[PDB]
Design a protein around this nucleic acid. Structure first.
Ligand SMILES: [Mn+2]
Ligand SMILES: [Mn+2]
Ligand SMILES: [Mn+2]
Ligand SMILES: [Mn+2]
Ligand SMILES: [Mn+2]
Ligand SMILES: [Mn+2]
Ligand SMILES: [Mn+2]
Ligand SMILES: [Mn+2]
Ligand SMILES: [Mn+2]
Ligand SMILES: [Mn+2]
Ligand SMILES: [Mn+2]
Ligand SMILES: [Mn+2]
Ligand SMILES: [Mn+2]
Ligand SMILES: [Mn+2]
Lengths: 82, 105, 99, 94, 99, 86, 106, 97
DNA sequence: ATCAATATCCACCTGCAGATACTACCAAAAGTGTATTTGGAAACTGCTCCATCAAAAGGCATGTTCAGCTGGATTCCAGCTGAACATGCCTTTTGATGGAGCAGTTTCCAAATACACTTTTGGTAGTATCTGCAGGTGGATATTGAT
DNA sequence: ATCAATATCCACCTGCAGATACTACCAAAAGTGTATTTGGAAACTGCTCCATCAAAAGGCATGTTCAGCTGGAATCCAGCTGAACATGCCTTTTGATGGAGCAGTTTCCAAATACACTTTTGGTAGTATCTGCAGGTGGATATTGAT
């Protein structure tokens, strides 16, 4: 099969996320809508993370790269350093 | 030789807090009382969280605090929840919460 | 007749199940594939610490769960119990993530 | 190699004060470490702005105190100020 | 025989008028008294630079206008044209002002 | 001498003033309960900014709240304001 | 005869002042010589960008003098400036004319 | 007694204004906005540069820290043009003396 | 009401991953003590601007009446979405295996700081004269609403 | 459609607040030159951990069927809320004045930094024993949904 990577984020997985979010009933158009939102989130965080990686002249994205990226995006994350 | 921490009655490292302030480029100078005051504040806030988290563990019939317990403690506490309103606790999950209109009958 | 729970009953059961637990809900490898793909568009030939990808998935899932909560409130506001694209869009707009 | 500093052994110490029979997983300890570092930065940063605003080159306990008041909600701030004053008073008398 | 514009016509006229202008919409002196009353309850014997009061009014009106914008979107989401307390409350919840 | 007692000045935020603000916000129709709701929301906002501003004032050991006190207070609450000495 | 660091860099914004503000601001122990030059150039550029668009808004409103209203129109009508200053309030700037379609009469 | 000096970017903002709109003026309130803007962006960039230096255990903020900070802070096209202006200004500055 | 199909709970048990307790090693960190330095509190006080007063007046708030049309309630039904189930695809696991590259060490020089000295300038203050546009008027054009 | 009531437009005007202009003045800022110090790039290397590979195994995604119940369309109507009006209060505007207290200047020492030297400690690495709880069990009973 030849599927896009974002399509690897499956309908049941998105369903599970919604359930933890307290959602009882889900429209069929939600799944594609969620994938688009998810991609934008990742693009924004990873772009910043890689920018930190590049500045440190590294080829490896570290957890601290990501943690720093998340903080300046206002999504501070505990548990992975810093 | 007696530590500034023991001198101040603290478990948290006064000397390290001072070194961290100096190297952090927060100001040209750091007063003597500043790292003592800050170390005490950090220790207190730590105690407050561990207390509530420990209680969360006991309420779940556990003796070892895990991320979930920290999340339960913080989100169930009005002031801690506010202080950490924009913070994500890894492997913390969420509070059990279902909107009333979604319940059957 | 064979056994069937009414529509909504199992949904509520799942809600209680996943609000009780803390495990990640997106499969690891597909998420990892997505991350590397996106990063390749910014900088080629990158490598990731394993903890880096995990940090990304913890953050991403926490974000979506939070978003679904707000989305749910928007649906209920319009006297529905079914979340729709316009619910997510309203939530993101008021959050200041868009428009 | 090198050494990586963290607050682990101090967090653990405090844990035994408040809950002598309670342990803490490594992942949970990592979260506590993130917490301490976060609040340190917030308080130090605000204290830094306070000094700058008032054209001072020194961060004293007075700057830490005002910073605490600005950052922490009601009761947390009250107790934090009390604990901070206590430790500075005690440190002085020694 | 007397002339009457339909309900909503003048309201629309007022929206266009005030979106075109930049002047403060709350009376100056009553706002100053509110500021002094609130401040006094926090600390007696305070004085205010006149620009301090004006800075507070600029910020307050900008906040409220922005809030009414989000509130309006919540009302419209529920297929209404009339903003209600629950619209404000939903807006502030999603904003994280009472989350 | 001292000034008359200040009280109930939230009502100085009148119904037409609130209507005007809503109009600039693009609002066409307004429920009767909106006005008391807005006053409560406004009071919370003002209290929070003023609390922080006065805290800056006290730390400087001044008895006069400055425009910068307010600007700094707004900044740390994410309501950055231009035009008053930023 | 002495040439300023601004002229040497081809800039209108003050390099010397920017360097001084960096050193006094407790941002780092040391400041490289290129840092205030680069920073001054960026600030000068962003200023030019806002003034260009603000001047256009003034012109659109038949004015020759830029006021805060024109600055607000310029920023909120430009997607990238709007994003950059999304959490900023312009005093006496007002808002963009914008009426939701459903509110219009049929 | 003399009132101490209050520095601002006014004369420099004014110079740039005349470059882009020769026959356009600016009010003192609008100039106040512009000064707040420059101060704001100054601090945002300097702040990000500071963190960046600290993250990498460097004691020096160079034009490289400023450039990365600009890329982190500014949106697409603004970042692109800012970087080129910054890079140009630096290479020109060094090519002198 | 009964009654059956599942879900959910509690008590108990056991393997093991991760927590612990131990010794030992060591560089970096923290303390101690002395000499030097300086930030900023204290005192004094110039002078900005804040609080307050008066007094006139009209912009705007208040309170009312009236009814247009909005929100809320009811009903209805087409069809979307949840539940259940049969496949089988691919994520997961784990365990070994190169080797990329992070990271530690040494070297050493362009570029930093430190300082003395000289020149330049942007800020303020003092007056003195333009000038863009707010706000007022009048009259032509446009919009709204009744018919 | 026509027509009338009213808002909207724009041209024109004038007063004036605020922008502009110029000279004087000066402390701080900024530049130039010289001496001294050093951060971090560069090259090299060890060892961490990242990528990949094979290889089952079954867990979980997917496609399908069927219908319960949800969303949305349509209809009705009570009464909320907007539009218009009368009335007159209190905000606005202008101007003056005392003096609180912000802010400028100079003095001076408690507390800062700066080293040198000594002692302690936290991070570490092996090494070995320990244990809290995940996950599996059976069986009681609670929940759900058909009658
Ligand atoms: Mn009171
Ligand atoms: Mn001094
Ligand atoms: Mn009246
Ligand atoms: Mn009727
Ligand atoms: Mn309706
Ligand atoms: Mn290699
Ligand atoms: Mn000059
Ligand atoms: Mn006009
Ligand atoms: Mn070196
Ligand atoms: Mn049917
Ligand atoms: Mn329904
Ligand atoms: Mn006095
Ligand atoms: Mn030890
Ligand atoms: Mn179990």
């Amino acid at each position: 099969v030849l599927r896009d990577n974002i399509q690897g984020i499956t309908k049941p997985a998105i369903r599970r996320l919604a359930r933890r979010g307290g959602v009882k009933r889900i429209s069929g158009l939600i799944y594609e809508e969620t994938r688009g939102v998810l991609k934008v989130f990742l693009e924004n965080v990873i772009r910043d993370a890689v920018t930190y990686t590049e500045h440190a002249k590294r080829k490896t994205v570290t957890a601290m790269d990501v943690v720093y990226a998340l903080k300046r995006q206002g999504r501070t994350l505990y548990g992975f350093g810093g | 030789a007696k530590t500034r921490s023991s001198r101040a009655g603290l478990q948290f490292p006064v000397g390290r807090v001072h070194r961290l302030l100096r190297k952090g480029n927060y100001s040209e100078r750091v007063g003597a009382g500043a790292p003592v005051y800050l170390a005490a504040v950090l220790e207190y806030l730590t105690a407050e969280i561990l207390e509530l988290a420990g209680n969360a563990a006991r309420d779940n019939k556990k003796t070892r605090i895990i991320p979930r317990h920290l999340q339960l403690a913080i989100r169930n506490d009005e002031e801690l929840n506010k202080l950490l309103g924009r913070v994500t606790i890894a492997q913390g999950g969420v509070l059990p919460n279902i909107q009333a209109v979604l319940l059957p009958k | 007749k064979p056994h069937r729970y009414r529509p909504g009953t199992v949904a509520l059961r799942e809600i209680r199940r996943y609000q009780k637990s803390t495990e990640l809900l997106i499969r690891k490898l597909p998420f990892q594939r997505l991350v590397r793909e996106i990063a390749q568009d910014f900088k080629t030939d990158l490598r990731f610490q394993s903890s880096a990808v995990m940090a990304l998935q913890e953050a991403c899932e926490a974000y979506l769960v939070g978003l679904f909560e707000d989305t749910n409130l928007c649906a209920i506001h319009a006297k529905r119990v079914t979340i729709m694209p316009k619910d997510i869009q309203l939530a993101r707009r008021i959050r200041g993530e868009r428009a | 190699r090198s050494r990586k500093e963290s607050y682990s052994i101090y967090v653990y110490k405090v844990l035994k004060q408040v809950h002598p029979d309670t342990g803490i997983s490594s992942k949970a300890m990592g979260i506590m470490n993130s917490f301490v570092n976060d609040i340190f930065e917030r308080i130090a940063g605000e204290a830094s702005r306070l000094a700058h605003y008032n054209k001072r080159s020194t961060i004293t306990s007075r700057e830490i105190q005002t910073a605490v008041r600005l950052l922490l909600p009601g009761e947390l701030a009250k107790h934090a100020v009390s604990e901070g004053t206590k430790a500075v008073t005690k440190y002085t008398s020694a």
